[PDB]
Amino acid sequence: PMYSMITPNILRLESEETVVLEAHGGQGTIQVSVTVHDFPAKKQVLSNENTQLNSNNGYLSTVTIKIPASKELKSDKGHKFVTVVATFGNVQVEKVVLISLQSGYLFIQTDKTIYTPGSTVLYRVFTVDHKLLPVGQTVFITIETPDGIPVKRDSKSSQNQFGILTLSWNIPELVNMGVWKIKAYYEDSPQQVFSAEFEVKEYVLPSFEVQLEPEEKFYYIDDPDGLKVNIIARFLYGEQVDGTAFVIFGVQDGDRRISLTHSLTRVPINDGNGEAILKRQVLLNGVQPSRADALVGKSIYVSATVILQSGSDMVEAERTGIPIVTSPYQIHFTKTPKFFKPAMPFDLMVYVTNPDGSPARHIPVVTQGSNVQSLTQDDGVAKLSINTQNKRDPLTITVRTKKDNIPEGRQATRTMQALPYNTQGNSNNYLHLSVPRVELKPGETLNVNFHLRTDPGEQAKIRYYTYMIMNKGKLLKVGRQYREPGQDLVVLPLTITSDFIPSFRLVAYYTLINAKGQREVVADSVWVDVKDSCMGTLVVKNGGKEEKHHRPGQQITLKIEADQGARVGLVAVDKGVFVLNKKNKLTQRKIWDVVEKADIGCTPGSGRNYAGVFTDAGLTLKTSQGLETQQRADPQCPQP
Template structure:
């Protein structure tokens, strides 16, 4: 009977934020169970604090065939909760085993999916029609069929001028708004909410201004994304290309300046006239041109340089196109070092994987930079993504360890090299037991394989199994168990599937005894890509298409996919490229809602789960702390803003 398995350990784990209107995956298992009997487990979500109503329930059976571990799926309805966005609401999550009830109080999230909005243009003039398409998906990135989405059009002054709603078909909806003749210029917003969960909103932007369409486009590209205080000059490449892809000849009038405290001030000495030949020209801002207006460049650190260019051409008639580039930061140091992907805790006697990010002043990756890390005086060169990885040999210390990193760029004086430090603290364990995970790569690709090394201490070699969970987008997507077989090191391979986009966490754990859970976790970034496939090509390719003529496109996509198309005037898109919906913006928003807070690891076994965004309860060991906030502490947050610009 189940009663006879006196050393078996029941386990309950789930996301520590349970989303309403979402299929949530709950993990249950029994470890070290030596009998053959199947074990029924009832999983429930109960109302809090009264515990008088089952909000959702399911049952699973643990048996030898599934290694006595399984996922159960439940869905909590939004109608059981208040719609007050400022009120924190909870449920009891229960797993009823034959002999034991495991229970946790869990914070409820009203982020029941993602809404993305695509406008037909990124810039509009007065009295034009703003057409937009609504995409809505579940946390699992499946289309939200029959979902009702409410939208509002909001002016730059914050005034709502239209409220609308859409019942989506296959996750898609459409709407429009006619701008009046007299209209506020600036950045407008479309605010979207799921009707069932209005507590969470999604914001998207478009620009309104008077504009004139031109026959050619001017693109400005800085030679460097920043101006370093010791630099002698800054170059900006000017490219003038017609809407049909032909190079344009003409003259460029250029003026540089600085944006300081939100105000623009030009450098009068930088005014210059440049020939544009075969579409190309180069403007140059010198150090002297800056010091004529600001003798002490150091006072401008933190401000940004802008360049305004007007290109006059006589190709087929005189025409002038203006373009401006800003945001070129003035910086004291060319690089910044970050430890955002390095765990803050180490296991005594085991290596610590240190991941150093080197970024330019505009936060772009800095590849090819030599970095020196102490202790160990180890050197490595950053890759294309600005990352250098080190493995610091074991610390036997039970005290905190200071880790320092500095750049070693021969072109920069020692006083200008970047330096950063962090303190790693020892993992806390009652039984001197440890588990350490290491990866063969910092970034993986969809369809690839990641190799995971698991190290255990000498005392743990007799324990038979390590359980692992994979968490992505706040949902459990995979579970499994590794047999230890007495060795200290195990190497396992995991395939990277679409459920793991755009990043995922691996959490591994075991019980060294009845009083402790030993765990470790790693965060893995997946290279941005589509979850499915899509290609577009003309049925009959041609060099050009006649005005008002029609042509056919061949669309290849996954079976039963719904594809939305939009035709964009190239001369309009050239005026504003900020507000386009891109794959990167989609994954950035998804990452923002990741409930995990750190790059991996934790203070002790239960904090490994908590920091990864999971709850854990075993009945014999005190479980994870109860989560009371949707957001992570600012110091540990590595995500980006949600607004799509």
């Protein structure tokens, strides 16, 4: 028989971590003891647990260990390790694991993202642990100038406020203007500084606002008519503007402003409407190289001073960042896996974006050569399944957008290369996990397809698949999916709960004894999105009748629904600030962006070998036959 031990490759101190124990071919009852020792001396048993392997659990059991944060492990010199030893009766299995205490998360929410002098910055700091549960610890909170000078250093304990540090600060009337920074760190971890930024500009009271709407959200460099920009000028109280707009165009050359002086036109504004056109001959001559290709990758800015007809007020606005490209889309292969399986379909995930970085919705993309065509959704991602041949050659894939009313020279096109999985001893023993692309919400049920491909003498030896579900760098669910002989497709139904948000990895494998008498392990993994929801629940609704328009000074009733014992922090903000600077405002996706960076996997699936699957997904393996994984030193993954 073969005994196997699977743990996550980084174990957290003061945390419940899951150890998987499994006896391939066990008989009777096998008592297993798991011991955690200090590295490299093994002088102290840090954790000790017990379980059994029998026929009732299928010779597969899990063990929860909690390594305490001792004074030797808290030392700041060198990456520390522990040694986990599992004893399967008389056979011991032993693996050295990297450790990290972590338990550091600080989220900062300002009440708004732009301020005038004299305003009050209302800001909250939420103090949670590694499980995102509230902790009561001392936090040092620093407000810094745009030049970086600290003007306010607070120290607040979140023990009695239970994790919601609610504070305020008054901006003085004379102050630095620019991008201010709030910084926060725990008292026991000063090197983990978390930050949010806000902007302080000056008082602006327009009698009328000016909006510069270009006809397209980009400029085609081979467009003969040019770039039309609609001038929409209206009062803040709603009325229309009659007057005269003085409009000038220009080129933003990276970090360079080139004023097009020959584009300066006088435009009348009648009933709040006017039009200024930048002709193509003004754009080419005004930039110092008069090349259409040397204008690609730049943007057009446009400034317009609108005067009222009685000469009464002038309000000037600017629309920057209108790109001078030929393709309105950018193809990205960032959400797709980099490794394919031979003679099995490759789930290509093409991410199509607008030139400002926003996701391009409902854009048809076609792969060249295979003619697979799909549409993007609201997230900008399209799924194209490419049927691969039974070859271990690198698969070169070119994706091209095919939206109508756009010429073929103006379509986005990008090329990638996918690499094949390497089997043991050039054998035909493969595994492929096939998952349908649904925006998975908690409450939906996912059917996962377990495809087998083996040599015909090796097919009957496979009785089960052993699957593992990981979420937030922890083993969430382990089980077995059994298989009758002759079943080339086995389906595991999986209910998505709230513990799967934001994303989860499913890793599955089978073992066998091949035609050379050697123990072969074949594995596969897949990364699945979950719709950005919440581990708990928090809704704010109306408590009275659903009135569309309210009056000033009207009493309304708010209905606030949360979990039992939850503390809810509130703010009522004007809508005009929420839309302005969105990159500094706390959203629910920004919670799920932060935990997505803290993960122990680097690739969205597959690997170089059997040890390539466990290491790329965040696991490690040690078997009694000698099958193992490499050691992890760095929690990060390299980029050029």
